[PDB]
Amino acid sequence: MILIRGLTRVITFDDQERELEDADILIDGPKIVAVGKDLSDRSVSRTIDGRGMIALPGLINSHQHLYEGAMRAIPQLERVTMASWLEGVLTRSAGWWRDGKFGPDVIREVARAVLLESLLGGITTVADQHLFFPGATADSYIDATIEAATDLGIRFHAARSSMTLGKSEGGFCDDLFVEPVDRVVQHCLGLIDQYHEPEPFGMVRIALGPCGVPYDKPELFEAFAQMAADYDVRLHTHFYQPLDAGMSDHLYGMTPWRFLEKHGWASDRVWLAHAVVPPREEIPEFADAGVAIAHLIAPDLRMGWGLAPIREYLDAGITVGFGTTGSASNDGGNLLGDLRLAALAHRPADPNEPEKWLSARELLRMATRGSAECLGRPDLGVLEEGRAADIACWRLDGVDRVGVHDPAIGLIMTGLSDRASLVVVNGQVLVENERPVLADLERIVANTTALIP
Amino acid sequence: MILIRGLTRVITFDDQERELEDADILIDGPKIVAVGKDLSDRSVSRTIDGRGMIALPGLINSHQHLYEGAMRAIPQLERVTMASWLEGVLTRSAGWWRDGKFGPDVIREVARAVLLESLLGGITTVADQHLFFPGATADSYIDATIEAATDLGIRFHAARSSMTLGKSEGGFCDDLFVEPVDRVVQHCLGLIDQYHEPEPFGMVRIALGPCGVPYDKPELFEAFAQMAADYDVRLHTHFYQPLDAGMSDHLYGMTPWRFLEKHGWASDRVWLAHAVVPPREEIPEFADAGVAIAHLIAPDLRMGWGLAPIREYLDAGITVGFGTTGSASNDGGNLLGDLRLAALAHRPADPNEPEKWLSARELLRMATRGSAECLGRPDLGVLEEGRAADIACWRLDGVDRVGVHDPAIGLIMTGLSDRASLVVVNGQVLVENERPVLADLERIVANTTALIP
Numbered sequence: 001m002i003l004i005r006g007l008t009r010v011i012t013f014d015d016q017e018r019e020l021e022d023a024d025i026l027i028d029g030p031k032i033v034a035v036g037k038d039l040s041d042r043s044v045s046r047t048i049d050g051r052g053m054i055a056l057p058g059l060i061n062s063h064q065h066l067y068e069g070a071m072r073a074i075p076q077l078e079r080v081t082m083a084s085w086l087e088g089v090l091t092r093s094a095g096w097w098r099d100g101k102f103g104p105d106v107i108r109e110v111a112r113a114v115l116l117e118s119l120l121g122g123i124t125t126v127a128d129q130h131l132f133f134p135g136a137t138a139d140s141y142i143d144a145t146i147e148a149a150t151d152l153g154i155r156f157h158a159a160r161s162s163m164t165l166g167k168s169e170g171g172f173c174d175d176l177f178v179e180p181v182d183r184v185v186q187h188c189l190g191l192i193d194q195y196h197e198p199e200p201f202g203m204v205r206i207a208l209g210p211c212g213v214p215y216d217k218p219e220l221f222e223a224f225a226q227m228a229a230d231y232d233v234r235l236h237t238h239f240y241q242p243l244d245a246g247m248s249d250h251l252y253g254m255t256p257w258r259f260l261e262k263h264g265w266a267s268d269r270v271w272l273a274h275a276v277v278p279p280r281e282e283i284p285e286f287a288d289a290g291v292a293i294a295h296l297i298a299p300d301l302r303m304g305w306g307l308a309p310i311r312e313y314l315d316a317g318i319t320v321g322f323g324t325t326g327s328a329s330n331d332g333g334n335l336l337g338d339l340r341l342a343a344l345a346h347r348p349a350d351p352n353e354p355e356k357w358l359s360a361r362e363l364l365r366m367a368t369r370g371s372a373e374c375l376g377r378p379d380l381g382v383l384e385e386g387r388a389a390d391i392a393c394w395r396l397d398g399v400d401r402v403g404v405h406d407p408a409i410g411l412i413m414t415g416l417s418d419r420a421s422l423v424v425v426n427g428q429v430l431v432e433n434e435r436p437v438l439a440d441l442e443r444i445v446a447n448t449t450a451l452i453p
Numbered sequence: 454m455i456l457i458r459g460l461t462r463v464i465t466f467d468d469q470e471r472e473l474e475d476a477d478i479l480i481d482g483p484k485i486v487a488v489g490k491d492l493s494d495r496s497v498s499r500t501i502d503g504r505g506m507i508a509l510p511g512l513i514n515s516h517q518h519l520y521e522g523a524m525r526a527i528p529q530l531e532r533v534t535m536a537s538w539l540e541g542v543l544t545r546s547a548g549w550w551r552d553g554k555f556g557p558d559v560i561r562e563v564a565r566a567v568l569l570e571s572l573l574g575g576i577t578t579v580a581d582q583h584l585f586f587p588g589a590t591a592d593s594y595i596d597a598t599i600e601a602a603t604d605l606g607i608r609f610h611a612a613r614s615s616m617t618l619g620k621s622e623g624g625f626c627d628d629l630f631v632e633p634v635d636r637v638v639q640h641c642l643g644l645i646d647q648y649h650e651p652e653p654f655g656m657v658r659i660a661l662g663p664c665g666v667p668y669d670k671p672e673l674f675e676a677f678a679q680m681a682a683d684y685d686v687r688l689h690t691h692f693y694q695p696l697d698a699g700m701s702d703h704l705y706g707m708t709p710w711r712f713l714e715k716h717g718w719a720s721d722r723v724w725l726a727h728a729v730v731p732p733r734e735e736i737p738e739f740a741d742a743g744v745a746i747a748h749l750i751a752p753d754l755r756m757g758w759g760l761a762p763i764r765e766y767l768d769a770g771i772t773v774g775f776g777t778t779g780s781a782s783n784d785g786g787n788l789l790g791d792l793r794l795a796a797l798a799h800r801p802a803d804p805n806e807p808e809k810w811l812s813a814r815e816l817l818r819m820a821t822r823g824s825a826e827c828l829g830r831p832d833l834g835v836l837e838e839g840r841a842a843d844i845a846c847w848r849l850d851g852v853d854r855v856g857v858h859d860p861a862i863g864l865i866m867t868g869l870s871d872r873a874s875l876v877v878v879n880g881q882v883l884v885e886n887e888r889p890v891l892a893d894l895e896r897i898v899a900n901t902t903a904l905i906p
């Protein structure tokens with residue numbers, strides 16, 4: 001057993017939103033045994049000094065595109081609209097791939113670096129949607145990301161993505177990535193068989209994640225809806241990015257939401273990325289259907305899209321989580337830093353109603369318990385007995401946080417650095433004193449850097 | 454002489470906007486002697502390995518309120534509009550002061566902490582606007598901020614501020630804070646005589662800084678205009694925050710800009726904080742007059758105000774710099790971090806015209822050369838022969854920056870940490886390996902933390 005003792009502040013996000021001062025967290029295997037003051041060092045084989053730190057549930061990034069880690073800070077993609085952006089990324093990724101510079105071995109190391117950064121930013125679980133499946137046959141890309149993740153000890157959800165609707169038939173997808181529906185379903189069934197850990201505290205899970213309504217066939221969506229029921233896995237896709245509604249009506253003469261509902265996706269098995277520009281009247285329907293929504297402030301701003309109606313979703317009682325998206329439109333994997341961005345960026349939408357502005361604690365919940373709920377993990381996102389020992393702590397005693405009166409608010413509103421001090425995943429200490437415990441950071445940096453096209 | 458050798462990237466912001474790869478910077482006393490490849494270590498007594506780093510001119514924070522470092526992350530002030538916020542801050546500071554908890558010895562230590570955070574964030578010059586002068590005499594608050602800055606060795610401008618317009622005659626402010634115009638003027642004269650260093654590479658300078666049109670008498674503005682001419686110092690005030698136009702119209706029946714014009718402030722001696730919501734017709738007048746503008750993205754968002762028309766100012770040829778404002782409305786002193794706020798936040802205002810969005814290089818220019826010009830410092834903000842050896846360097850070889858294709862864009866668009874690696878002010882190495890070389894980090898944190906009310 002491991003005991004973290006004398007944490008300055010502990011934010012549980014439990015059902016009464018308890019917070020604790022000068023308290024302890026007790027851990028046994030993958031699970032939290034207790035959260036409270038002066039816990040006994042009974043069977044404890046190690047005590048970690050928590051003084052001067054704030055502890056949260058591990059952060060959960062409910063929307064990544066790991067492979068985009070190779071595409072950061074490209075000058076020609078710095079200031080572009082979505083059309084130019086999408087064009088530029090696919091062009092580069094397919095070009096590199098054709099030249100043998102972008103194989104699963106390269107994606108493995110790119111995933112390794114972005115996931116390591118994730119751990120260092122206090123992120124204990126990542127859901128990746130790998131979108132790059134060149135040739136009719138999707139290579140071992142997903143296996144590569146899963147291998148990086150398991151080597152690191154980070155909890156990992158792989159949402160198998162696709163582009164089953166080629167332009168060669170009214171679609172918008174290049175036929176280089178367009179697989180037959182049945183081939184996609186079959187790859188997924190195999191992934192689940194090899195990789196899925198459905199038990200509580202499972203470290204690798206599979207989700208089914210079409211690229212989106214404008215890019216995939218209704219048959220894929222229905223095929224997935226059926227699988228989700230069969231195997232109790234979750235459904236994930238992009239939702240109401242700008243221009244989507246136009247494309248959906250053009251192919252199906254209905255809204256993206258009407259479509260999803262028509263094809264079995266209006267269910268509590270689903271979590272949806274962005275949800276930037278939904279029709280207001282559809283929002284209560286998301287509520288009743290029980291879908292979850294992942295807020296991605298960085299990409300939404302970066303593409304010039306604007307502010308998703310997050311207050312509205314919360315008002316409706318819709319589950320809201322948080323994510324960074326891939327590093328080709330972020331361009332970092334810093335989930336904590338993005339929370340500050342959401343905290344501030346939303347305010348000018350309601351100049352005279354501060355009560356509607358998202359609070360630090362609401363955002364911190366999104367990034368932990370909210371995301372947990374998006375991924376269908378009731379074993380994550382909350383510091384309480386019986387939940388997973390997935391814990392992220394930050395120091396409060398740096399010169400850049402002097403004068404802070406509320407540590408949770410300080411975490412978002414102050415600081416030169418979002419580096420986590422102590423990070424535990426599945427009861428395993430992976431970061432301590434802001435340094436990787438098991439990973440060879442310098443070796444990973446050199447190996448991955450050598451492989452960037 | 455000091456040689457920084459083999460910097461991976463050097464951004465000069467010189468007149469040709471030169472950048473260099475695998476290049477050196479040579480320093481002799483307070484000034485830069487050379488910038489280029491393979492510089493001679495002829496008369497060098499210390500060589501510093503710059504490999505894996507990007508070097509910029511030191512960042513210049515053109516707008517701070519250092520004493521607000523004591524008021525960070527206050528829950529009652531988390532989501533409030535300007536009116537409530539300003540009452541909350543004035544109230545607290547008056548209260549603390551009345552209770553003997555907020556005198557100059559306290560402000561000295563708050564300033565030391567925020568100024569050290571500044572150095573650790575790559576900021577090499579700070580302009581502070583201190584307006585808190587309760588009582589029947591002008592206490593030694595400014596003296597205290599200067600003492601902190603001189604101890605640390607950070608370059609410092611003090612804009613002596615005030616609130617001379619009492620609520621009894623239109624001012625939105627209690628007469629506890631109101632000083633006679635003549636007291637402010639007399640104090641400023643003594644500050645200039647005592648502290649001002651007008652020579653090139655001067656380390657302390659005085660500016661004259663009324664809180665703003667809604668808060669000070671026209672006579673103070675005119676007095677300062679004369680004093681700035683007579684003593685060749687600069688003028689600084691808040692400018693076009695929302696509601697200013699209303700108050701200005703009520704009191705004087707003119708716009709804040711016409712007021713400034715009328716009372717001697719339409720000149721190249723002036724720099725203006727925020728400038729969020731000016732009438733578009735006035736912008737060309739700003740340009741003709743030659744006033745500079747400080748962009749403060751974090752406060753503007755935090756207060757619900759929105760986006761200053763920065764592209765418009767740039768298009769007009771107006772000098773644009775950057776700052777953080779005080780830590781009660783930020784709530785950090787992290788200038789580099791706020792640049793990312795600006796890079797992203799401006800985009801949604803022009804969804805279809807990415808060419809209007811501010812670029813990483815434009816933003817970095819604001820935080821360096823642009824701020825230097827606000828502060829009237831031709832000796833700062835540019836890495837070239839004959840300018841001050843004020844230099845900030847960040848490491849590029851961290852795992853959170855793998856995949857970065859352009860280091861300058863990467864500096865803004867990626868990273869878990871904004872912590873500078875190497876910082877030089879006036880030829881003096883102050884930060885190395887992300888640590889103070891002269892200041893006792895832990896001691897300063899301990900001492901200041903004990904003084905926070």
Ligand SMILES: CCNc1nc(NC(C)C)nc(SC)n1
Nearest residue numbers: 518664665691752756778779782
């Ligand atoms: C009163 C005019 N404006 C203004 N003042 C401050 N600070 C003082 C009270 C130290 N902060 C801000 S942040 C928008 N605005």
Ligand SMILES: [Zn+2]
Nearest residue numbers: 065238273325
């Ligand atoms: Zn996505």
Ligand SMILES: [Zn+2]
Nearest residue numbers: 518726778779
């Ligand atoms: Zn100010």
